[PDB]
Amino acid sequence: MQIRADFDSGNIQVIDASDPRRIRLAIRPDLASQHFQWFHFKVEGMAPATEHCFTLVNAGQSAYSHAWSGYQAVASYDGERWFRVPSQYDADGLHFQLEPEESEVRFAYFEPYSRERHARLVERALGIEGVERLAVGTSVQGRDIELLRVRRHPDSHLKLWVIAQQHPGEHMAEWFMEGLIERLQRPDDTEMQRLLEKADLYLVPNMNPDGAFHGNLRTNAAGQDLNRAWLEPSAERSPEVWFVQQEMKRHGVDLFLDIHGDEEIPHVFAAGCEGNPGYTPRLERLEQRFREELMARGEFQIRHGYPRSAPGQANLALACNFVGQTYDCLAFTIEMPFKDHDDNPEPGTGWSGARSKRLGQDVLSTLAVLVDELR
Ligand SMILES: [Zn+2]
């Protein structure tokens, strides 16, 4: 038996894998920050007809250790079909067991989205009618930050921005983008026809390629939390955010969605800008419309989420608040669960890459409905 993480988005430290019934492992802290929670490794040469019991020993010291409770690890034999496995959490850490049908299998905190797939996603995007790579930024380690624009009518006047995965460990985010982009390949898509008549789409499939490649959870290569750098972006420390802000200034913003993933809450939800000094009645109305329309179409609810912000007490270092206020536009942070969307239980897979994609396409339907109210 051999366990490794020497690959894209891999993360794990092997303690002792000599006894299948007592496998010890540790989660690796981010490149330049103390945060950790995301894990991704492969096991090879497992004995057949044998139970293998795994334990992430430092789960208790992870960034969000209270989120472990109720969480079921994800696994895959072919890296295509991912399934949930029996898991428990106590003082010794996160435990999960599996009697593998195959000699090899891989585990991860969520269905990984590799930079390899990212590349194929961009390729397909550029092969789509009206889709272009409007501009490209560069990460701290020199990886591409594509800004794709979907434009099918030279007279549209609205700019709808959607960026994802500023936090590397939140892989469900890029899955959301894949679904959103792929819907653009439909021949007779009436809703999209209307949307694109009035607006152009500005998409950044991945805001932190270095973090994602290195299996980080929270920060970019420099150790900076990108969703805390919007008030004071750095060309050197947070180039990913700096790039996006320059382009936003060039073209303008009339809508902004920041796609994330939440470790704790087992529900898909959306946080707004109610704490912004610039939170107007118009924006409060639009936020109500958006949630109302999305709730009627996708796996999205409004009962659970983060505590709301008191009037004028928002943290403008956050993308959602910063963009919404700077441009006086509807803005939300979309949150997908690492667990399941309990409203629609599917224990065998929990929240997945597929359900993330579907949410991405449902969100497009919501935008089509609200396009005439944004401005
Ligand atoms: Zn996040």
Q: Is 304 one of the annotated binding-site residues? A: no
Give the integer Cα–Cα distance in Å for 227 and 233. Answer: 10
Transcribe 10-45 into DSSP letters.
-B-EEEE-S-GGGEEEEPPPPTTSS-----EEEEES
Sign of CA dihedral 251, 252, 254, 256: positive
**List of residues 6+ apart from 275 with CB closer than 8 A:** 308, 309, 310, 311, 312, 313, 314, 315, 321
Cβ–Cβ under 8 Å, residues 39 and 217 = no
Give the integer Cα–Cα distance in Å for 171 and 9. Answer: 10
**C-alpha of residue 3 to centroid of ligand 1, in Å:** 28
Distance of CA 284 to the CA centre of its chain: 25
* Residue 159: both structure tokens together: 């700019």
Q: Which of 4, 11, 5, 68 is nearest to 218 (CA)?
A: 11
Transcribe 202-213 into DSSP letters.
EEES-S-HHHHH
Give the integer Cα–Cα distance in Å for 173 and 168. Answer: 9
Cβ–Cβ under 8 Å, residues 140 and 239 = yes
Residue carrying structure tokens 């010291």: 61
Residue 335: active-site member:
yes
Q: Is 44 one of the annotated binding-site residues? A: no
Residue 227's CB is within 10 A of a number of other CB atoms, namely: 22
Cβ–Cβ under 8 Å, residues 30 and 222 = no
Q: Which CATH class is domain 114-375?
A: alpha beta
Q: Residue 309, SS3? A: coil
Question: 146, 174, 287, 335: which one is catalytic?
Answer: 335
**C-alpha of residue 91 to centroid of ligand 1, in Å:** 26
Residue carrying structure tokens 């993308």: 319
**C-alpha of residue 174 to centroid of ligand 1, in Å:** 12
Q: Domain ranges in the chain? A: 1-113, 114-375
CA-CA distances (angstroms) from residue 14 to 23, 34, 118, 216, 222?
Answer: 9, 19, 28, 17, 25
Give the integer Cα–Cα distance in Å for 333 and 269. Answer: 9
CA angle in degrees (0–180, nearest 5) for 3-6-7: 120
**C-alpha of residue 262 to centroid of ligand 1, in Å:** 7
| Three-state SS sequence of 45-82 | CCCCCCCEEEEECCHHHCCCHHHHCCCCCEEECCCCCC
* Residue 64: both structure tokens together: 């969000």
**List of residues 6+ apart from 40 with CB closer than 8 A:** 5, 9, 10, 11, 12, 106, 107, 108, 109, 112, 215
Give the integer Cα–Cα distance in Å for 300 and 269. Answer: 6
Residue 92's CB is within 10 A of a number of other CB atoms, namely: 13
Q: Is 346 one of the annotated binding-site residues? A: no
Q: Which of 155, 159, 150, 153 is nearest to 129 (CA)?
A: 150
**List of residues 6+ apart from 57 with CB closer than 8 A:** 15, 24, 25, 26, 92, 93
CA-CA distances (angstroms) from residue 360 to 92, 157, 258, 289?
Answer: 37, 22, 12, 18
**C-alpha of residue 170 to centroid of ligand 1, in Å:** 6
Q: Which CATH class is domain 1-113?
A: mainly beta
The experimental technique used to determine this model is X-ray
- The torsion region of residue 252 among left (phi > 0), alpha (psi -120 to 50) and beta comes to left
Residue carrying structure tokens 């944004």: 374
